[PDB]
Amino acid sequence: KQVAGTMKLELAQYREVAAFLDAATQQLLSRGVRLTELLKQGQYSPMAIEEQVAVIYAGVRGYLDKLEPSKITKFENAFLSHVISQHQALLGKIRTDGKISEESDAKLKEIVTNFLAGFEA
Amino acid sequence: KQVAGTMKLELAQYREVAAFADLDAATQQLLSRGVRLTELLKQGQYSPMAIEEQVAVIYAGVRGYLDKLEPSKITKFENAFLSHVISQHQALLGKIRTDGKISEESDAKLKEIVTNFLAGFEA
Amino acid sequence: ATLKDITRRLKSIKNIQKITKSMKMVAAAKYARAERELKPARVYGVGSLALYEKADILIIGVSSDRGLCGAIHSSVAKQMKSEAANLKEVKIIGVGDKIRSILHTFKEVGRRPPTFGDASVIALELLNEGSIIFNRFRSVISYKTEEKPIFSLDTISSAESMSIYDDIDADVLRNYQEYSLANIIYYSLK
Amino acid sequence: DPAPATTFAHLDATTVLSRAIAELGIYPAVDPLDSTSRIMDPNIVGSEHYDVARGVQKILQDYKSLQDIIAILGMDELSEEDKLTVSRARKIQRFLSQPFQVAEVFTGHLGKLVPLKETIKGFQQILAGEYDHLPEQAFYMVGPIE
Amino acid sequence: DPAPATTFAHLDATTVLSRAIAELGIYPAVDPLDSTSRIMDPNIVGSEHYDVARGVQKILQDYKSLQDIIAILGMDELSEEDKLTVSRARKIQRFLSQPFQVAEVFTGHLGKLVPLKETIKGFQQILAGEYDHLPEQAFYMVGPIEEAVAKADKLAE
Amino acid sequence: DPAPATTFAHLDATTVLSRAIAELGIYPAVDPLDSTSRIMDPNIVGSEHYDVARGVQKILQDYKSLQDIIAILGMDELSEEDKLTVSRARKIQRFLSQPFQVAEVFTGHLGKLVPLKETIKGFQQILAGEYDHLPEQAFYMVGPIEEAVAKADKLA
Amino acid sequence: QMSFTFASPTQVFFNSANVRQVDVPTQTGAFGILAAHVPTLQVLRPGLVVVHAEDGTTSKYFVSSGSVTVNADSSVQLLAEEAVTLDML
Amino acid sequence: VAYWRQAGLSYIRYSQICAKAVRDATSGSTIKIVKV
């Protein structure tokens, strides 16, 4: 409910200025296009709710704003495999805490920023 | 068939490209040809043509001999050219009609007829 | 005339409209500014043309590279072709790829607001009788393509009427022309 | 369509809600530029109320124009004047928002019932600027101006 | 129409033909954005085949969405990326046409049969930009991609 | 509609009036690209009448075709030669207008009867470029071509 | 009376103003134009400009380059590429 | 003759430099050359 609300609003704000300039609307476009890629999904792999959240989180907190949009699907797949393997504990708490704690926030930023730099290597 | 073989698809592609269109050289040549074949397929009423005569007219356009002629002069060229072939080259026309084909020889013959007549007409 | 087709066409023209309307707003804006930067530049430019008003003495078209401003680049093109025809030996320039396009140089015009710095580059390029064609702003709803003479010929500028002018060396003058040549280009751009 | 077309012959007023407004977070999601009354005029509601209302549509339809330029050219090409119409307007936008008693089960926040008096007043001000320094929050999802 | 709308549920693959495509001389007149198959799945035909086919659909759908702005604001008003969508989509449209053996009485061209790997490769190469230099008419009515490179040479006189 | 549509076959000449044209103030409000006659043949009306009528129809259809593509972006983006199809077609459309004796109350213009040879000359001249310098408005609501010229002077 | 006109490509300090005298930095010396000087032409030098007002206390300006023109009619035009008042240097 | 002439420089070029110097104590150049 927390990250969906943010995404709802940023997508609405994206729709309003789309198909197009000031930096503020460069950012609104850059975010919308990225949230759009994140909503893509292949068949036959429904996801657990914490996994969905970890993913939406990467986008609404801006961690993917500088990644080329065409690489987001590959990013999300590798990022998800990585967090499911090495970070089961973070997934537990996202699932459990009932709302993104200060801890998960710090942890997610750490995993994301560094996984992404590797991924762009 | 020797002269009309691929003209239908060519004309349909020409129309699409005319509407869509620093055009590249192939696009330009496609436009120059289609605009000219379009004039050549205009025809008035009540004077249906013998097949060998239709062949001789279309030859002129599909072998590239009218590509530099101004498009508004095509119909007048065609009318003058046909009178000339009918009047002085009956044999050639009879051969295309009778062989039902354009022989190697009929083709060399038409080529000089067209180019020389065209230079005159353009004078 | 099928619901679907009509429907598609309805949303798309709706985009176009949103887009063209904003583009209008930008133009107005850039025009708002341009209008200002022109008050002073016209003083500076007229002022530089004074010597020829007071003393009786190449085709250069000026527009830009972009836009849907249609009658803008056409008028300059119109008046440029007219001249080249009515004339002896010609060597030309257009400021804006658009001039090059409309005819067959310079580019990066109109996109952002022009400056003396741009003018100096054209002048400089040209040094390594002329006329300069551009649109004189009257109204938001009107402009006119004037031609301004470029006597810049240093040679031409050595004539009787200038006998009244005190100092003047053949080369204190060469510098004066060069500079004036750059003010008339700057003025056209603005 | 025949159904709304027949129905309209019997209406004296309308209340038009909008998804684009709901999605950008304002509830109730009323479009202030598309609701009317077969009878809203100074003779009826009285100059005061009237003027407060009508003064709010001009600001809104004025802020709407400046939207393109703000997004495209940047919220800076605005003249000190126009720049004023924007902050007043955005402020009026949110003062139009309202927390509903029946909405408590959703947002968890308290609801407010606002008297015509307290409503007409608070909107009359804005123009003034008694709140220019006042940020756009003591305005979003509140009841009375205070 | 009720007859064809009811037939769709009985099929595993569909090839939908269109008069608007036929009219341009593109044969076979297959609408590439309305022809479907139950086995068009990466786990069945493999990810390369699957990815190229979806990239062909995407560029054709993006070109279709721009056509009515090009026609009104002109190509110059388009971004450079939008310009590549255009030239490449228009080449891909022609490369999907093909001379059929049973259609020689109609095209004046010899028929062609193109192996699955050559089809995949030709389209992957166009999408990748390998032929941004060749004219559009080179991809029209041919078989394999080598045939378009040769037609481009022919046309260049 | 089945009624007007079935009537077409019973005719030798059809004059089709259009509301759109009437709303542009062109009277009689005849659609010049939907009015036909079985007698419009060069062996009947002679080759000059026939060639001028075909040239007028070609220029008006060419213009109609440009309109469709200018719908949004006006004539600026248009190309000078097409600019010439437009200006001529616009003059021809107005010269097709004409004040009728029975309509003087609505046009506030005396009625005019134009002889056949003069109708041909005037359209022949416009198509030849002889009046590319006159304003459009001058060809509106007059009789013969000499009246357009006068009205042009009057407009100055 | 002489009509003075001083400006840069961006700013205009004087437009046809009745000034008593003006001092300019030239390639050859630095001279004061008088409401009645013989016609001369000159190109500027980085230096100082002084405009003697109709009412004493004279205003100063700094110029990098440009031109100066004095006409038989008492009209004077001073045009500098860059022109800033010492106040901002 | 000045020093900079004889050295190839012109006057516009000269003003260019002095103008700029006053500044350091407008002036863009977006323009681009298309020589062919």
CSV table of N, CA and C in Angstrom, one decimal, chain D residues 39-119:
chain,number,residue,atom,x,y,z
D,39,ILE,N,-29.6,28.2,-11.4
D,39,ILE,CA,-29.8,29.3,-10.5
D,39,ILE,C,-28.7,29.7,-9.6
D,40,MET,N,-27.6,30.1,-10.0
D,40,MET,CA,-26.5,30.6,-9.1
D,40,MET,C,-26.2,32.0,-9.6
D,41,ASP,N,-26.8,33.0,-9.0
D,41,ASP,CA,-26.5,34.4,-9.4
D,41,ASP,C,-26.7,35.3,-8.2
D,42,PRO,N,-26.0,36.4,-8.2
D,42,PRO,CA,-26.0,37.4,-7.1
D,42,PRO,C,-27.4,37.7,-6.6
D,43,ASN,N,-28.4,37.8,-7.5
D,43,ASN,CA,-29.8,38.0,-7.1
D,43,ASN,C,-30.2,37.0,-6.1
D,44,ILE,N,-29.7,35.7,-6.3
D,44,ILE,CA,-30.1,34.6,-5.5
D,44,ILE,C,-29.1,34.4,-4.3
D,45,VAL,N,-27.9,34.0,-4.6
D,45,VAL,CA,-27.0,33.7,-3.5
D,45,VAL,C,-26.4,34.9,-2.9
D,46,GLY,N,-26.4,36.0,-3.6
D,46,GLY,CA,-25.9,37.3,-3.0
D,46,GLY,C,-24.5,37.6,-3.3
D,47,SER,N,-24.3,38.8,-3.9
D,47,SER,CA,-23.0,39.3,-4.3
D,47,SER,C,-21.8,38.5,-3.7
D,48,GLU,N,-21.7,38.7,-2.4
D,48,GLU,CA,-20.6,38.0,-1.6
D,48,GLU,C,-20.3,36.6,-2.1
D,49,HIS,N,-21.2,35.6,-1.8
D,49,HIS,CA,-21.0,34.3,-2.2
D,49,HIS,C,-20.6,34.3,-3.7
D,50,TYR,N,-21.4,35.0,-4.5
D,50,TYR,CA,-21.2,35.0,-6.0
D,50,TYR,C,-19.8,35.4,-6.3
D,51,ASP,N,-19.4,36.6,-5.9
D,51,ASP,CA,-18.0,37.1,-6.2
D,51,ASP,C,-16.9,36.1,-5.7
D,52,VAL,N,-17.1,35.5,-4.5
D,52,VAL,CA,-16.1,34.5,-4.0
D,52,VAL,C,-15.9,33.4,-5.0
D,53,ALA,N,-17.1,32.9,-5.5
D,53,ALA,CA,-17.1,31.8,-6.4
D,53,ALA,C,-16.4,32.1,-7.7
D,54,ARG,N,-17.0,33.1,-8.4
D,54,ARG,CA,-16.5,33.6,-9.7
D,54,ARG,C,-15.1,34.0,-9.7
D,55,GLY,N,-14.6,34.6,-8.6
D,55,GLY,CA,-13.2,35.0,-8.5
D,55,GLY,C,-12.3,33.8,-8.5
D,56,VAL,N,-12.8,32.6,-8.1
D,56,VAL,CA,-12.1,31.4,-8.0
D,56,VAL,C,-12.0,30.7,-9.4
D,57,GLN,N,-12.9,30.9,-10.3
D,57,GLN,CA,-12.9,30.3,-11.6
D,57,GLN,C,-11.9,31.0,-12.5
D,58,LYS,N,-11.7,32.3,-12.3
D,58,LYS,CA,-10.8,33.0,-13.2
D,58,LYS,C,-9.4,32.7,-12.8
D,59,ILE,N,-9.1,32.6,-11.5
D,59,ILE,CA,-7.7,32.2,-11.1
D,59,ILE,C,-7.4,30.8,-11.7
D,60,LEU,N,-8.3,29.9,-11.5
D,60,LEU,CA,-8.2,28.5,-12.0
D,60,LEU,C,-8.0,28.5,-13.5
D,61,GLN,N,-8.9,29.1,-14.3
D,61,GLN,CA,-8.7,29.1,-15.7
D,61,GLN,C,-7.5,29.9,-16.1
D,62,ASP,N,-7.0,30.7,-15.2
D,62,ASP,CA,-5.8,31.5,-15.5
D,62,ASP,C,-4.5,30.6,-15.2
D,63,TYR,N,-4.6,29.9,-14.1
D,63,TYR,CA,-3.5,29.0,-13.8
D,63,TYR,C,-3.3,27.9,-14.8
D,64,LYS,N,-4.5,27.5,-15.4
D,64,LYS,CA,-4.5,26.4,-16.4
D,64,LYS,C,-3.7,26.8,-17.6
D,65,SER,N,-3.7,28.1,-18.0
D,65,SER,CA,-3.0,28.6,-19.2
D,65,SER,C,-1.5,28.5,-19.0
D,66,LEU,N,-1.0,28.9,-17.8
D,66,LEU,CA,0.3,29.0,-17.4
D,66,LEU,C,1.0,27.6,-17.3
D,67,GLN,N,0.1,26.5,-17.3
D,67,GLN,CA,0.7,25.2,-17.0
D,67,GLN,C,1.7,24.7,-18.0
D,68,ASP,N,1.4,24.8,-19.3
D,68,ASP,CA,2.3,24.5,-20.4
D,68,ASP,C,3.7,25.0,-20.1
D,69,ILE,N,3.7,26.4,-20.2
D,69,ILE,CA,4.9,27.2,-20.0
D,69,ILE,C,5.7,26.8,-18.8
D,70,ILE,N,5.0,26.6,-17.7
D,70,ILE,CA,5.7,26.2,-16.4
D,70,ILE,C,6.4,24.9,-16.6
D,71,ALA,N,5.7,23.9,-17.1
D,71,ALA,CA,6.2,22.6,-17.4
D,71,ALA,C,7.3,22.6,-18.4
D,72,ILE,N,7.0,23.2,-19.6
D,72,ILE,CA,8.0,23.3,-20.6
D,72,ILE,C,9.1,24.3,-20.4
D,73,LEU,N,8.8,25.5,-20.4
D,73,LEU,CA,9.8,26.6,-20.3
D,73,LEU,C,10.3,26.8,-18.9
D,74,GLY,N,9.7,26.1,-17.9
D,74,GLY,CA,10.2,26.3,-16.6
D,74,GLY,C,9.3,27.3,-15.8
D,75,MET,N,9.0,26.9,-14.5
D,75,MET,CA,8.2,27.8,-13.7
D,75,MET,C,9.1,29.0,-13.2
D,76,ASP,N,9.6,29.7,-14.2
D,76,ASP,CA,10.4,30.9,-14.0
D,76,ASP,C,10.2,32.0,-15.0
D,77,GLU,N,9.8,31.6,-16.2
D,77,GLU,CA,9.5,32.6,-17.3
D,77,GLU,C,8.3,33.4,-16.9
D,78,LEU,N,7.7,33.0,-15.7
D,78,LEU,CA,6.5,33.7,-15.2
D,78,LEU,C,6.9,35.1,-14.7
D,79,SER,N,6.0,36.0,-15.1
D,79,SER,CA,6.2,37.4,-14.6
D,79,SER,C,5.9,37.4,-13.1
D,80,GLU,N,6.3,38.4,-12.4
D,80,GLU,CA,6.0,38.5,-10.9
D,80,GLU,C,4.5,38.4,-10.8
D,81,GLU,N,3.8,39.0,-11.7
D,81,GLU,CA,2.3,39.0,-11.7
D,81,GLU,C,1.8,37.6,-11.9
D,82,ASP,N,2.0,37.0,-13.1
D,82,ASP,CA,1.6,35.6,-13.3
D,82,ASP,C,2.1,34.7,-12.2
D,83,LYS,N,3.3,34.9,-11.8
D,83,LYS,CA,3.9,34.1,-10.7
D,83,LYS,C,2.9,34.1,-9.5
D,84,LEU,N,2.2,35.2,-9.3
D,84,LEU,CA,1.3,35.4,-8.2
D,84,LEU,C,0.1,34.5,-8.4
D,85,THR,N,-0.5,34.6,-9.6
D,85,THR,CA,-1.7,33.9,-9.9
D,85,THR,C,-1.5,32.4,-9.7
D,86,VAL,N,-0.3,31.9,-9.9
D,86,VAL,CA,0.0,30.4,-9.6
D,86,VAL,C,-0.1,30.1,-8.2
D,87,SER,N,0.6,30.7,-7.3
D,87,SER,CA,0.6,30.3,-5.9
D,87,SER,C,-0.8,30.5,-5.3
D,88,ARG,N,-1.5,31.5,-5.7
D,88,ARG,CA,-2.8,31.8,-5.2
D,88,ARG,C,-3.7,30.6,-5.6
D,89,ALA,N,-3.6,30.3,-6.9
D,89,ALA,CA,-4.4,29.2,-7.5
D,89,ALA,C,-4.1,27.9,-6.9
D,90,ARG,N,-2.9,27.5,-6.9
D,90,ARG,CA,-2.5,26.2,-6.3
D,90,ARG,C,-3.1,26.1,-4.9
D,91,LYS,N,-3.0,27.2,-4.2
D,91,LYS,CA,-3.6,27.3,-2.8
D,91,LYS,C,-5.1,27.1,-2.8
D,92,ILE,N,-5.8,27.7,-3.8
D,92,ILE,CA,-7.2,27.5,-3.9
D,92,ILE,C,-7.5,26.1,-4.2
D,93,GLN,N,-6.7,25.5,-5.1
D,93,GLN,CA,-7.0,24.1,-5.5
D,93,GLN,C,-7.2,23.2,-4.3
D,94,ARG,N,-6.2,23.3,-3.4
D,94,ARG,CA,-6.2,22.4,-2.2
D,94,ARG,C,-7.3,22.8,-1.2
D,95,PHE,N,-7.5,24.1,-1.1
D,95,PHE,CA,-8.6,24.6,-0.1
D,95,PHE,C,-9.9,24.0,-0.6
D,96,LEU,N,-10.0,23.6,-1.9
D,96,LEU,CA,-11.2,22.9,-2.4
D,96,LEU,C,-11.2,21.5,-1.9
D,97,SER,N,-10.1,20.9,-1.6
D,97,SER,CA,-10.1,19.5,-1.1
D,97,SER,C,-10.7,19.4,0.3
D,98,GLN,N,-11.3,18.3,0.7
D,98,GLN,CA,-11.9,18.2,2.0
D,98,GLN,C,-12.0,16.7,2.5
D,99,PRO,N,-11.7,16.5,3.7
D,99,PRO,CA,-11.7,15.3,4.4
D,99,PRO,C,-13.2,14.9,4.8
D,100,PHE,N,-13.7,13.8,4.4
D,100,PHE,CA,-15.1,13.5,4.7
D,100,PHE,C,-15.2,12.6,5.9
D,101,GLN,N,-16.3,13.0,6.7
D,101,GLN,CA,-16.6,12.1,7.8
D,101,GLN,C,-16.6,10.6,7.3
D,102,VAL,N,-17.5,10.4,6.3
D,102,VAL,CA,-17.6,9.0,5.8
D,102,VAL,C,-16.2,8.6,5.1
D,103,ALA,N,-15.2,9.4,5.1
D,103,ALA,CA,-13.9,9.0,4.4
D,103,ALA,C,-12.9,8.5,5.5
D,104,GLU,N,-13.3,8.7,6.7
D,104,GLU,CA,-12.4,8.3,7.9
D,104,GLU,C,-12.1,6.8,7.7
D,105,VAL,N,-13.0,5.9,7.4
D,105,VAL,CA,-12.7,4.5,7.2
D,105,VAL,C,-11.6,4.3,6.2
D,106,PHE,N,-11.4,5.2,5.3
D,106,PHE,CA,-10.3,5.1,4.3
D,106,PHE,C,-9.0,5.7,4.8
D,107,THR,N,-8.9,7.0,4.8
D,107,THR,CA,-7.7,7.7,5.2
D,107,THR,C,-7.3,7.6,6.6
D,108,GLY,N,-8.2,7.4,7.5
D,108,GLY,CA,-8.0,7.3,8.9
D,108,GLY,C,-8.1,8.7,9.5
D,109,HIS,N,-8.1,9.8,8.7
D,109,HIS,CA,-8.2,11.1,9.2
D,109,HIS,C,-9.6,11.6,9.5
D,110,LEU,N,-9.7,12.6,10.4
D,110,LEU,CA,-10.9,13.2,10.8
D,110,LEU,C,-11.6,14.0,9.7
D,111,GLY,N,-12.9,14.0,9.7
D,111,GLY,CA,-13.7,14.7,8.7
D,111,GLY,C,-14.2,16.0,9.2
D,112,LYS,N,-14.5,16.9,8.2
D,112,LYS,CA,-14.9,18.3,8.5
D,112,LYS,C,-16.1,18.7,7.7
D,113,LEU,N,-17.1,19.4,8.4
D,113,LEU,CA,-18.3,19.9,7.8
D,113,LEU,C,-18.1,21.4,7.9
D,114,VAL,N,-18.0,22.1,6.7
D,114,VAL,CA,-17.7,23.5,6.7
D,114,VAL,C,-18.9,24.4,6.3
D,115,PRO,N,-19.3,25.2,7.2
D,115,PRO,CA,-20.3,26.2,7.1
D,115,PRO,C,-20.1,27.2,5.9
D,116,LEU,N,-21.2,27.5,5.3
D,116,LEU,CA,-21.1,28.4,4.1
D,116,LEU,C,-20.2,29.6,4.5
D,117,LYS,N,-20.5,30.2,5.6
D,117,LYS,CA,-19.8,31.3,6.2
D,117,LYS,C,-18.3,31.1,6.2
D,118,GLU,N,-17.9,30.0,6.9
D,118,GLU,CA,-16.5,29.8,6.9
D,118,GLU,C,-15.9,29.4,5.6
D,119,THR,N,-16.7,28.9,4.7
D,119,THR,CA,-16.3,28.6,3.3
D,119,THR,C,-16.1,29.9,2.5
